[PDB]
Amino acid sequence: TNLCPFHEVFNATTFASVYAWNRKRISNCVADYSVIYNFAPFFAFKCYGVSPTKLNDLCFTNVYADSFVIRGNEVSQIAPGQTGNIADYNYKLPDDFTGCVIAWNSNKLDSKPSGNYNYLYRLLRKSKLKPFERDISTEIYQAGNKPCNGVAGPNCYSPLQSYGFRPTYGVGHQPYRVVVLSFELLHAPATVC
Amino acid sequence: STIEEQAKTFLDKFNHEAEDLFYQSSLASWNYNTNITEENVQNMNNAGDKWSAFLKEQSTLAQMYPLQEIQNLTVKLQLQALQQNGSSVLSEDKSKRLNTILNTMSTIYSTGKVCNPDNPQECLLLEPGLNEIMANSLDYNERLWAWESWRSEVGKQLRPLYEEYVVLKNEMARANHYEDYGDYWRGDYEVNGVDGYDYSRGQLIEDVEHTFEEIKPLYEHLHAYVRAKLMNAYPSYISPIGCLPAHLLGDMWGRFWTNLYSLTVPFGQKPNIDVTDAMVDQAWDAQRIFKEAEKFFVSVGLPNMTQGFWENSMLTDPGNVQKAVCHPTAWDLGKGDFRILMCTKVTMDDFLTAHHEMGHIQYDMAYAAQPFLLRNGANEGFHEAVGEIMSLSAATPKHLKSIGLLSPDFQEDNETEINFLLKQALTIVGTLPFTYMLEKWRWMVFKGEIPKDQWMKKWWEMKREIVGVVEPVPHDETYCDPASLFHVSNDYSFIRYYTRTLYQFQFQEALCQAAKHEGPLHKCDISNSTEAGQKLFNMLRLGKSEPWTLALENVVGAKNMNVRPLLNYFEPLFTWLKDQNKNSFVGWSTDWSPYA
Ligand SMILES: *[C@@H]1O[C@H](CO)[C@@H](O[C@@H]2O[C@H](CO)[C@@H](O[C@@H]3O[C@H](CO[C@H]4O[C@H](CO)[C@@H](O)[C@H](O)[C@@H]4O)[C@@H](O)[C@H](O[C@H]4O[C@H](CO)[C@@H](O)[C@H](O)[C@@H]4O)[C@@H]3O)[C@H](O)[C@H]2NC(C)=O)[C@H](O)[C@H]1NC(C)=O
Ligand SMILES: *[C@@H]1O[C@H](CO)[C@@H](O[C@@H]2O[C@H](CO)[C@@H](O[C@@H]3O[C@H](CO)[C@@H](O)[C@H](O)[C@@H]3O)[C@H](O)[C@H]2NC(C)=O)[C@H](O)[C@H]1NC(C)=O
Ligand SMILES: *[C@@H]1O[C@H](CO)[C@@H](O[C@@H]2O[C@H](CO)[C@@H](O)[C@H](O)[C@H]2NC(C)=O)[C@H](O)[C@H]1NC(C)=O
Ligand SMILES: *[C@@H]1O[C@H](CO)[C@@H](O[C@@H]2O[C@H](CO)[C@@H](O)[C@H](O)[C@H]2NC(C)=O)[C@H](O)[C@H]1NC(C)=O
Ligand SMILES: *[C@@H]1O[C@H](CO)[C@@H](O)[C@H](O)[C@H]1NC(C)=O
Ligand SMILES: *[C@@H]1O[C@H](CO)[C@@H](O)[C@H](O)[C@H]1NC(C)=O
Ligand SMILES: *[C@@H]1O[C@H](CO)[C@@H](O)[C@H](O)[C@H]1NC(C)=O
Incomplete structure (x- = not known):
């Protein structure tokens, strides 16, 4: 009777941006995995490796949960092997990955008629990210063969860009809230189980 | 690190920067149009001003990136369109004036x-x-x-205002490096840099005149029939042979001849197909009409509507509480938002308009995948032909009987076929000579072949000759007869209507050939065919990605427009009219002057 804090991450007021996706590690608790069914019909529920039918019977060493808000069609890019803007720059998954990915529509609390502007993403960078790394540094993007000062002006672009959300947006542009569950057996000699 | 890479990055930022502002402006315009108040008009004004300022600033910023250095073809189209709707030329106190x-x-x-x-x-x-x-x-x-x-x-x-307008407009057209402003309009039908598929500005005029001279026989014969019927109706006012006097064609300007009906019907004994009675008999509704339209558009093999459309649409007049401008439009707010502003009144005509507008909406959904600068459909006539073909195929007695509004015991006869064909022709073929004349006259006026002092006399002589209608009362240089048209008064091109008929009839022939159906094409439908749907959707996906010549090839299998589909459509009317006009003499004589 020492339950894991899944309810805390799922039901929260804010979820933060994509390029600064939060990380949380939890251990030494009673796993329940019953809170997941206390939500609306999930837009996508795909599990890689483990199977929800069995679920809690397994053992593991460490588990990680990451949460962030994306837009509509961008859900598909969250996959083991795929290509796209968000997967190449904003947030990357390794090919040899196992776990489960969960995302549900949330165009009722993250969208305002005046236009929500508290969510951003990166669309201009080089050096496609190695899996599981976060780049939060913002600097003026160099384009061409001219020295570039702090001011962008022409031929220099400031990266990052806001989504903008309104209740009348069509499906595929409505905000989505995604949480990805990542855990490993730690095949190397592990003290705990 | 290259110029094309720089252009790609610039366009990538531009699209995401511009979609939000365009959405805001279009939403404000929709709110004003459905709700006419001072706050709404001020909001629309400031939103439009911001959008225009952003567009002009971006266009000025796009001064670099030389096209001859640009290699990718699709980049050139976006860059050219941006430069064209962003170029601000000439001086202050001139542009403002x-x-x-x-x-x-x-x-x-x-x-x-x-x-x-x-x-x-x-x-x-x-x-x-x-x-x-x-x-x-x-x-x-x-x-x-x-x-x-x-x-x-x-x-x-x-x-005088129109004179100064023409002078300043040619002044701008000179700076745009175009040959003249007539050339500026004619540049829309232009494709260059592509082998096989290419179109210059010169070929348009010769194609138009070739098509018109091919069409002239049928129009001449219809004019002879109309003159005979008008002489029968109006006594002692029309010469038996000669030009047909104005004031009688209907409408303020005589563009459409539909109001002339009910006076020249050949067989008035047979009841009309008009089925507005069954709607009130079964207690139809606007929801039911639009649901039937959706059912047809999903039976042809195309996606249904969206719940956002169904909940944010605007279909029935709220009443005296809120004032709205009742006029059918198919708005595209962007970001996956579509809705209609219309006022249904439960009529067969309204049913046809519903099937007409839903076609535009489906086209808008179709080209949504392409970039922002390429969203708008290729050519300015395609987007109207796609709307009109559904109207042509949705009014057949076969389709009406299949729906059930038509009496199941109704039967078709050649007299009813002649009535229907004449009623269709009165609007379809009547407007072509008028549009051709108006566009040709305005082209010559802009180019400068016609001197100023001869504008009115030359215009009226051309009206006497080409369309066979004579002026009733003397006009001099004081009058400006063509200025009464809304389109010429508000700076709108006018050859799109001429191209619309040819495009719609070619599309209809291709579709009805794809869906095997024998007999005359004047009674054809595509309600239950899944092949014509794919044939249409393949071209609907592209947008401005490919030249309109290539799109036309993909649709019909030809390279350029022809009047053969229209003549094939109107063969029975041609034969019946030839049979009727044995005694009468066709043509006109401009020498006869009831004006004098
Ligand atoms: C680059 O620059 C060019 C040139 O400026 C732009 O081209 C414009 O494209 C738009 C889109 O079609 C044109 O808008 C059209 O205007 C027609 C004129 O109608 C007038 O009159 C009616 C009353 O009779 C008014 O209600 C109306 O507001 C106008 O004042 C309309 O008839 C057209 O509507 C047609 O399509 C709609 C689609 O929903 C149907 O519902 C209608 O029934 C109808 O079939 C249309 O709205 C505009 O005229 C073009 N400009 C010029 C100067 O002609 C490009 O868009 C631009 N590129 C960009 C911005 O990316
Ligand atoms: C001119 O520039 C445009 C814009 O880049 C080029 O179109 C691009 O073509 C590539 C294919 O070479 C497309 O890549 C595709 O990406 C999707 C992403 O999921 C992937 O699934 C596909 O397998 C493919 O790799 C790219 O999307 C496309 N860009 C756009 C905006 O449509 C075009 O090819 C250039 N001209 C020439 C002649 O190459
Ligand atoms: C039509 O426009 C008027 C003017 O804005 C709207 O009246 C306002 O409605 C909002 C609600 O959205 C109120 O907060 C304002 O106080 C109202 N102002 C006035 C002067 O009454 C009206 O609601 C609009 N009609 C619609 C949207 O159907
Ligand atoms: C297209 O298919 C639909 C459904 O197969 C046809 O609708 C049926 O028409 C028959 C003919 O009288 C009726 O008995 C059925 O009740 C109709 N079913 C439905 C669901 O409406 C339609 O007639 C077909 N149209 C054409 C032109 O073939
Ligand atoms: C989320 O948590 C708060 C406080 O724990 C609770 O009041 C709220 O009801 C929860 N959300 C749902 C959907 O139950
Ligand atoms: C469209 O929606 C209608 C209404 O629910 C449904 O009957 C039809 O099957 C749908 N068609 C498609 C292609 O989604
Ligand atoms: C129309 O059909 C009737 C019989 O169906 C026939 O007597 C008549 O001659 C036909 N008229 C024309 C113009 O085809």
């Missing part, structure tokens, strides 16, 4: 007073009974007075 001139022209066209015959008293307007009496009046003198009165009140003041 031209804008004020346009505003004054719009205001004076909107405010038009005819007053009373030889009596200063209350004055009418075109939206009120001014054009209604022309539509439904049988009094020759009453039509005489109003037709000249409208031009007398409006046009005399527009003549």
